[PDB]
Amino acid sequence: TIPHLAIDPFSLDFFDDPYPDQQTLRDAGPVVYLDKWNVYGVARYAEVHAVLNDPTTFCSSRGVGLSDFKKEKPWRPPSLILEADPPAHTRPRAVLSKVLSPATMKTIRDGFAAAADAKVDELLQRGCIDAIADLAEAYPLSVFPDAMGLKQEGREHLLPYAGLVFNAFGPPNELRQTAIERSAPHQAYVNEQCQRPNLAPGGFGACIHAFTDTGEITPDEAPLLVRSLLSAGLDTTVNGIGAAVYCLARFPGELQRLRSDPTLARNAFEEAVRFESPVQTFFRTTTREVELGGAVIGEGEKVLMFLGSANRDPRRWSDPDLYDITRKTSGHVGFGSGVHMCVGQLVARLEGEVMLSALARKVAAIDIDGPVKRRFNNTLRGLESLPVKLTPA
Ligand code: MH0
Ligand SMILES: CCCCc1ccc(C(=O)O)cc1
Ligand SMILES: [Cl-]
Numbered sequence: 001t002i003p004h005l006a007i008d009p010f011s012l013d014f015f016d017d018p019y020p021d022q023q024t025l026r027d028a029g030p031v032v033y034l035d036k037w038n039v040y041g042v043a044r045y046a047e048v049h050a051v052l053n054d055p056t057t058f059c060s061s062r063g064v065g066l067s068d069f070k071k072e073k074p075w076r077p078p079s080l081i082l083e084a085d086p087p088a089h090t091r092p093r094a095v096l097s098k099v100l101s102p103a104t105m106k107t108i109r110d111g112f113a114a115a116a117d118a119k120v121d122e123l124l125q126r127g128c129i130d131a132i133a134d135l136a137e138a139y140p141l142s143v144f145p146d147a148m149g150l151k152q153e154g155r156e157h158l159l160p161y162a163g164l165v166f167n168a169f170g171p172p173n174e175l176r177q178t179a180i181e182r183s184a185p186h187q188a189y190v191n192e193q194c195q196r197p198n199l200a201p202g203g204f205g206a207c208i209h210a211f212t213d214t215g216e217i218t219p220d221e222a223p224l225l226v227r228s229l230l231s232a233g234l235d236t237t238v239n240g241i242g243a244a245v246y247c248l249a250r251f252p253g254e255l256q257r258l259r260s261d262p263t264l265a266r267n268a269f270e271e272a273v274r275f276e277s278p279v280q281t282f283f284r285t286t287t288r289e290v291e292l293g294g295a296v297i298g299e300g301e302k303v304l305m306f307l308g309s310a311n312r313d314p315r316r317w318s319d320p321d322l323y324d325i326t327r328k329t330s331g332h333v334g335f336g337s338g339v340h341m342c343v344g345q346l347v348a349r350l351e352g353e354v355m356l357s358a359l360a361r362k363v364a365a366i367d368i369d370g371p372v373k374r375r376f377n378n379t380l381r382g383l384e385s386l387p388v389k390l391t392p393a
Contacts, residue, residue, distance in 0.1 A: 030293025058284035065169035136242035149203020162235035170378025239382030243276035269352030277308035
């Protein structure tokens, strides 16, 4: 009654061109079974959205990766927010919400925007750049580690530690095993910067530690909460900004509309998050037998959500394969949905907005002038190299 497919969604063939296989998964039915890894899969918008908004049935405490924490030891201590269900999740989420709050964005907006404008000026003087290393990576590295309050030395561990966290959500393929086999130096760096003494005052990390007085989190919880932001806060925005530049390179008609109204910068980024979905997939675990779209799913089973596929489901979106910077993007699941919805989305949207704003005002054309290279990750989608030529406005 549930179709069985042999598609491996964690194979290099799938990462290269996931959209044909994603249509196959959507059209096979609301719920499929993935024989390769012995998990259920949901790829339409309706079921992906329903799983995300039923945290009691589809829990996160047994892991949001393939590994089931009731069966295998986690490779690192589980996240206190990402891999926690209510009520345990509520207090750490509230703290992170207040740290990354609307009121907090007012404190950083001018600095984030100025660094965005400075970087575009620096790239325009170079002309032929790599939009990944020189922009998608360079810009967030110049604002987020400082916003975190991190020291200057050692920041080369941040992106490797991030790509390790997102590879480790996947199955035990070579991508995951090769990452974990090199983890120790990055884990040691990250775990040290989470201690209150090593975080500059006024930064995100210090603010989390200051929330131990309220009774929302204890002092021993604060280091793992800083770890969350160092795990989720950098590589996702890199891939998001990378995707936006990619989209503007592939759809010059949208760059022209953006140039003619730079207030579209925020929705241009949001649409790139829908269109590319930097976070492609992750898992939930069923706490009971549950009927999902006419198919019953036993207790203790892993359910794989295709977030990128749900952001391109024609049953929910009009012309989903088109990059449209004036689309009503509200309702996309690129930031998740429900109680776990990305608590750092204001930081991501801010970085994306001010960077697309800088490009909208300073750049007249973005032309790909070199081999594009994809970066392969079990959970992240994005580019390794994007050779582009920037033409000043
Ligand atoms: C500064 C911090 C920060 C930034 C920036 C950030 C940027 C991004 N993120 Fe995202 N992310 C951050 C910190 C988190 C946390 C701590 C959590 C876990 C929240 C919870 O309650 O479990 C999270 N993000 C949760 C999520 C989830 C939902 C996970 C789940 O349901 O299990 C998604 C899909 C996500 N993110 C995507 C993205 C994308 C896409 C971007 C950027 C374009
Ligand atoms: C399922 C991946 C969502 C992004 C993410 C990664 C890590 C954390 C964390 O370390 O808590 C949170 C969210
Ligand atoms: Cl770690």
